Each structure stands twice: as structure tokens, then as C-alpha cells.
Amino acid sequence: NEKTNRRMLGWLRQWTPAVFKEQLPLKRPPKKILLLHGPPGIGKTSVAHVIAKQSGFSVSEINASDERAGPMVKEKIYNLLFNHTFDTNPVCLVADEIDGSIESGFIRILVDIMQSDIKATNKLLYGQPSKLLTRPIICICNNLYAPSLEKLKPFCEIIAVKRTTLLERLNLICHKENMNIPIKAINDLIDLAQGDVRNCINNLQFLASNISWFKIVNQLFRKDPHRDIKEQFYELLNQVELNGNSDRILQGCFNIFPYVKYSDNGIRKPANISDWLFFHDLMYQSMYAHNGELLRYSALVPLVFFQTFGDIANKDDIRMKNSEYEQRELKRANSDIVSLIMRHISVQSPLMASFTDRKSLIFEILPYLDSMISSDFNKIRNLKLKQAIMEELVQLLKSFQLNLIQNRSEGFDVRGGLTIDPPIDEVVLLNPKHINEVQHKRANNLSSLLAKIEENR
Amino acid sequence: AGNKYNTLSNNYALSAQQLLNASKIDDIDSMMGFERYVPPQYN
Amino acid sequence: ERDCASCDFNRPGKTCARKLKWAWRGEFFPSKMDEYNMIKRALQNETFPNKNKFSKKKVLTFDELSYADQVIHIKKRLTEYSRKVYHRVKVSEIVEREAIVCQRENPFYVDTVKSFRDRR
DNA sequence: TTTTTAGCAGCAACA
DNA sequence: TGTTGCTGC
Numbered sequence: 244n245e246k247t248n249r250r251m252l253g254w255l256r257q258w259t260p261a262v263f264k265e266q267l268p269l270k271r272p273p274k275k276i277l278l279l280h281g282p283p284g285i286g287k288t289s290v291a292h293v294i295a296k297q298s299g300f301s302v303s304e305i306n307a308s309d310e311r312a313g314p315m316v317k318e319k320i321y322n323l324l325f326n327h328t329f330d331t332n333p334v335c336l337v338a339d340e341i342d343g344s345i346e347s348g349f350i351r352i353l354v355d356i357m358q359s360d361i362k363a364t365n366k367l368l369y370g371q372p373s374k375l376l377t378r379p380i381i382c383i384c385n386n387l388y389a390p391s392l393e394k395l396k397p398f399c400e401i402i403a404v405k406r407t408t409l410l411e412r413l414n415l416i417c418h419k420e421n422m423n424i425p426i427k428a429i430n431d432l433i434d435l436a437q438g439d440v441r442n443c444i445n446n447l448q449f450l451a452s453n454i455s456w457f458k459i460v461n462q463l464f465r466k467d468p469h470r471d472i473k474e475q476f477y478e479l480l481n482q483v484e485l486n487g488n489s490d491r492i493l494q495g496c497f498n499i500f501p502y503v504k505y506s507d508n509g510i511r512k513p514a515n516i517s518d519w520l521f522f523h524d525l526m527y528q529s530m531y532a533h534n535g536e537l538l539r540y541s542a543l544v545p546l547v548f549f550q551t552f553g554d555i556a557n558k559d560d561i562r563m564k565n566s567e568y569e570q571r572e573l574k575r576a577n578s579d580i581v582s583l584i585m586r587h588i589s590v591q592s593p594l595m596a597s598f599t600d601r602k603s604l605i606f607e608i609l610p611y612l613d614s615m616i617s618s619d620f621n622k623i624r625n626l627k628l629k630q631a632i633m634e635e636l637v638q639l640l641k642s643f644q645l646n647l648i649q650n651r652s653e654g655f656d657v658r659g660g661l662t663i664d665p666p667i668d669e670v671v672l673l674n675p676k677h678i679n680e681v682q683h684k685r686a687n688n689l690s691s692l693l694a695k696i697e698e699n700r
Numbered sequence: 701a702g703n704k705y706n707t708l709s710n711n712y713a714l715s716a717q718q719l720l721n722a723s724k725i726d727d728i729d730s731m732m733g734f735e736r737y738v739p740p741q742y743n
Numbered sequence: 744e745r746d747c748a749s750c751d752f753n754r755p756g757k758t759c760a761r762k763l764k765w766a767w768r769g770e771f772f773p774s775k776m777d778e779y780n781m782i783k784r785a786l787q788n789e790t791f792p793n794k795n796k797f798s799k800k801k802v803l804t805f806d807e808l809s810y811a812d813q814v815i816h817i818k819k820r821l822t823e824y825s826r827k828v829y830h831r832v833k834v835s836e837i838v839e840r841e842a843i844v845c846q847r848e849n850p851f852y853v854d855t856v857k858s859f860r861d862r863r
Numbered sequence: 864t865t866t867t868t869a870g871c872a873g874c875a876a877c878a
Numbered sequence: 879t880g881t882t883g884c885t886g887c
């Protein structure tokens with residue numbers, strides 16, 4: 244990334260007139276913050292440190308993910324930006340992992356400092372007869388499009404670090420320790436350390452004295468044509484066993500297998516794997532009932548995916564997600580809504596509660612109740628029949644204890660949508676096309692039903 | 701490429717709602733003596 | 744001058760181009776185009792409430808606002824800036840301008856006025 | 864969502 | 879003392 248490293252150095256040299264009073268209203272860069280983004284382990288932090296030191300700045304690093312007290316940190320950042328350090332050298336602030344700050348405190352403080360400096364500069368330019376930012380700020384993220392950074396981006400100079408720099412650093416350490424290491428062995432050490440700089444330096448020191456579950460899932464669908472299938476199988480078995488998280492690996496395999504290319508005859512391969520997956524579910528249920536002796540067999544089920552679906556065609560890494568946690572939380576929320584409706588029926592309908600099972604309520608009663616509420620009353624020309632149906636629907640809303648709430652969360656005084664509480668809609672409406680049609684019809688019906696409920700009150 | 705069928709249904713529904721309002725207006729107009737006169741054919 | 748130059752009735756000796764004066768009046772901010780651009784760049788670093796209702800995204804950037812809303816926010820900060828730097832919010836100026844009234848152009852507007860005047 | 868224009872008096876605040 | 883707002887000409 245030499246071009247990127249020269250751009251960073253060029254941006255830090257634009258601070259030189261303001262900080263060092265050297266000749267290349269304060270001639271500062273238009274963008275006062277440098278924002279570095281890119282993959283982990285490529286040296287973002289190391290490049291920020293080296294270029295800041297090379298430019299004559301003292302480097303102060305803050306991890307933004309660990310500092311869960313922006314309002315307090317505030318004092319640290321204000322001292323580091325505006326107070327003279329005892330060091331002869333001006334401070335450069337390096338903020339690492341700024342995308343990890345779940346609490347916008349750190350970013351709000353930086354935005355407040357930038358806005359205060361813009362107000363102070365405009366007063367110096369236009370003010371007829373306020374702490375100015377005299378120090379550079381470097382911020383490092385993994386993700387540029389993180390919601391927290393949206394307010395900071397306009398003040399930032401954005402620099403992408405793409406995927407050598409570790410090899411150059413390790414060579415410089417070898418040369419300073421008088422170690423004659425062949426460049427091949429340093430590459431093999433980098434590959435062993437997976438780009439961990441700390442692990443690399445420790446392994447080098449030891450020489451001188453003398454698998455993410457996702458990566459395993461993608462490896463389970465890959466066959467190398469140049470290695471024995473048995474050696475690959477034992478290597479994968481050892482990696483699955485060392486990880487101890489066989490369940491997450493299998494859930495990964497389950498989400499990936501439909502998208503994987505596998506020579507297909509009749510999609511039987513999937514039928515054989517449903518029986519294993521069922522075997523895993525029985526084994527996982529038995530782990531809570533019996534002392535975990537059965538845990539040794541849990542590593543075998545992921546390896547059936549390597550045997551059945553492993554192909555040379557699968558060269559690209561498929562990214563994955565956790566639909567199950569979202570489905571479990573949604574199933575919990577829907578079960579809680581249904582449990583609340585069942586309690587409401589028990590309090591009002593003395594007999595209905597005896598005939599209503601949870602399943603019959605979800606599949607039979609609630610879909611019909613919603614179809615009755617969503618029915619187009621605008622097609623009914625007979626006012627008497629419209630009034631009678633509306634009186635029966637008000638009686639049904641009362642039997643199920645369904646409250647019409649005016650959600651006034653619109654915010655702009657136009658059409659506060661009426662919503663049913665509890666929201667039966669989230670339990671019954673499975674089809675996204677039907678959701679939009681039903682919402683438009685319901686809005687006119689619910690206003691008529693609310694007016695009738697108010698008339699009855 | 702995923703909504704071309706849901707716009708046609710709403711326009712037929714709106715045209716049917718407008719015809720139903722026009723029928724109610726024809727009923728009210730006739731109550732108030734405004735029967736819909738159609739003139740004789742003249743060639 | 745363009746549409747008059749494109750017209751085949753535009754000869755040497757033309758009588759049909761009646762020139763008449765009018766007094767234009769601007770009210771403008773004392774602030775210049777560099778100061779306007781400085782206020783625009785300052786507003787691009789601010790965040791704005793979505794006039795959205797049953798909608799969701801509660802917050803917009805400046806460039807995600809409608810151009811009319813962008814100019815409403817610009818005019819607000821320019822009123823404060825102009826008052827702070829120039830001690831006035833507005834300048835007003837009157838400029839005498841000239842325009843060409845075609846006499847050969849299709850008479851439908853003026854015929855409506857003449858005819859309406861005569862019927863009255 | 865429908866929608867003529869500019870010039871002026873004068874009370875009251877604030878630049 | 880002047881400008882600026884608002885209502886109502």
C-alpha cells in the first residue's frame with residue numbers, strides 16, 4: 244500500500260505549518276480527521292503509528308471499543324488535544340476500533356470538538372474585534388458504513404487500506420537483532436501466525452533464543468485435488484475437535500449447503516444429510532440429559548458434509564449469518580403475543596378458553612379474526628348491514644381484548660396509523676405482498692371501528 | 701424485478717369505489733328530482 | 744434577443760420590436776458565493792430529522808434532504824452569518840432593465856383584454 | 864394543493 | 879436611529 248502510505252504522510256505534512264511553524268488562517272488541512280478503513284490484520288494501526296512518528300508527532304492511542312465512558316473519556320481527549328505534553332513532540336491522537344463504540348459518546352465528543360473548532364475558525368476569519376484544534380486526529384475502523392460514523396464522515400479524509408507490510412517489519416526486527424533469517428522462513432512464520440503481529444514477534448524471539456468456525460465450514464466444502472482425501476479428512480477432524488463448537492460449525496454447514504455447487508443427480512445427497520442432521524439433534528438433546536460422553540461423536544456429523552458435498556468447484560468463500568437466533572427471538576415474541584391473547588380470552592371468554600389450544604388459536608382463530616377486521620367495508624352499500632357487522636366486530640374485539648391504539652409516531656401531523664394491540668398482524672401475516680394490501684385496507688376500517696368504539700363508550 | 705402485479709389491482713379497486721360513489725350520487729340526485737335524461741335518437 | 748434574432752420578421756428597419764423599461768428589485772444576503780459554500784459545507788456535517796411518519800429512518804444527512812429543505816437550512820444559517828459579519832440580514836437594490844415586446848406575436852391574450860373591455 | 868401584484872402606516876423589538 | 883416583523887390597508 245505504498246501509494247496509501249504516501250497519501251497519509253502527505254496529509255500529516257499539511258499539519259506541519261500549524262504545529263511546527265515550519266514553512267512548506269492556520270493553513271490546516273480542510274478535513275481535520277483522517278479515517279483509515281480496511282480488513283483486520285493488514286497493519287492499519289501499525290501504518291498510523293509509523294507515519295505519525297516519522298512526521299515528528301508523539302503518538303497517543305485510544306481503543307474506542309474499550310472506553311465505555313465517552314462523557315468521562317472526554318477529559319482524556321480534551322487533555323490530549325489541548326494541553327501541552329511534557330514531551331518535546333506534539334501529540335497525534337490515534338483512535339482505534341471507532342466502529343465498535345456501541346455508545347455514540349466518543350464520536351459525539353469528536354463531532355462537538357470539530358463543530359467548536361469550525362465556530363472558532365469562522366470567528367477568526369470574520370470576527371470584528373475558543374480552543375482551536377492544533378493536533379491531528381487519526382481514526383481507524385474495520386467498517387466505513389457503520390451507522391455511528393455517519394456524523395463523523397463529513398469531517399474525515401477517508402483512506403482505504405487494501406490487502407508484505409508484516410514481512411518488511413519482521414525483516415527490520417531481524418536486522419536490528421542481528422538475526423540472519425531467510426525470507427522464506429519469515430513468510431512461513433507469517434502464514435503460521437495468520438497475520439497476528441504479536442504471535443509473529445514471539446515466534447521470532449523463540450527462534451532467536453535457539454480456525455474461525457466460518458473458515459472450517461468453507462474448508463468442509465472444499466476438496467484439494469493435490470492432497471490425499473484421507474489426510475484432508477484427518478486434518479479437518481482435528482480442526483473441528485480443537486474448536487469445541489461442533490454445533491455452530493454444523494449450523495454453518497446447514498445454511499451453506501443449498502448455495503454450494505455439488506454434482507447433483509437427484510438431490511439425494513440432501514436426503515442422506517437430513518438423517519445425519521436428525522442424528523445430531525438427538526445427540527444434542529441427549530447432552531442435556533446425560534454426562535457428555537456423546538460429545539466425541541459430534542465432530543463426525545460436520546465431516547459427512549466434506550464427504551458428500553466437498554467439491555473442487557467451491558473455490559469462493561460463502562459468507563454466512565444466524566437466521567436461527569432471529570427466528571428464535573421472533574418465535575419467542577410471537578409465542579409471548581399468543582400467550583397474552585390466550586390470557587385475555589381466559590379473563591373474558593369463560594368458555595372459549597376451554598376449547599382454545601395454542602395451535603388452534605394460531606392456525607384457525609387468528610387468521611379468520613384478521614380476515615374479518617381487514618375486510619373491505621367500502622363495498623357494502625347497505626348502511627344497516629355495515630352497522631350490524633361493525634357492532635359484531637366491536638363485540639369480537641372486546642372478547643379477544645384487542646385495543647385500537649392510535650400510533651401518533653408519524654411525527655408530522657398527517658396520518659397517525661391505527662394499530663391493534665396486541666399486534667395479531669405479526670403472527671398471522673406470513674406473506675410480504677399481503678402485508679401491504681392489508682395495511683391500506685385496515686387503516687380505513689380501524690378508523691371506522693375506533694369511531695364506533697368511541698360512540699359505544 | 702419484484703412488484704409489477706400489485707399496482708393493477710389497486711386501480712381496478714379505486715375505479716370500482718368511484719363507480720359505487722357515482723351510483724350513490726345517482727340515487728341521491730334522483731331523490732332530489734335530477735333523473736338522468738337521455739335524448740331521443742335523431743338522424 | 745435570441746427569439747427576436749431567430750424570427751424571420753427581424754429585418755433592417757423593423758418596427759415590431761417595442762422596447763420598454765422596468766425596475767427590477769432584489770433582496771439578497773450580503774454574503775458571497777464563497778461564504779454560501781462555507782455554510783453549505785458546514786450543514787453537510789449536521790444531521791436532520793426525517794419528515795417521515797409511518798416511515799422509519801428517523802435521521803437524514805444534508806444531501807439526503809430535499810433541495811427545498813437544504814435551501815431552508817442554508818437560508819437560516821445565512822441569516823445568522825450575515826447578521827454577525829455584515830451587521831445586516833439583507834441588502835436591497837433596484838436595477839432598471841429593458842425588455843422587448845413583440846408586436847407581431849399571435850394576438851390571443853390582448854384580444855381577450857380588448858374584447859373583454861369592449862363587452863364591459 | 865391551491866395560490867393575482869407592490870407600496871405603505873405604525874406598533875414593538877432589537878441591531 | 880434605523881431595520882424587521884406582522885397585520886391590513
Ligand code: SF4
Pocket residue numbers: 746747748750751752753754757759760761844845846847848
Ligand atoms: S416579430 Fe418580434 S421576435 Fe419576430 S422579428 Fe419582430 S421583434 Fe423579433
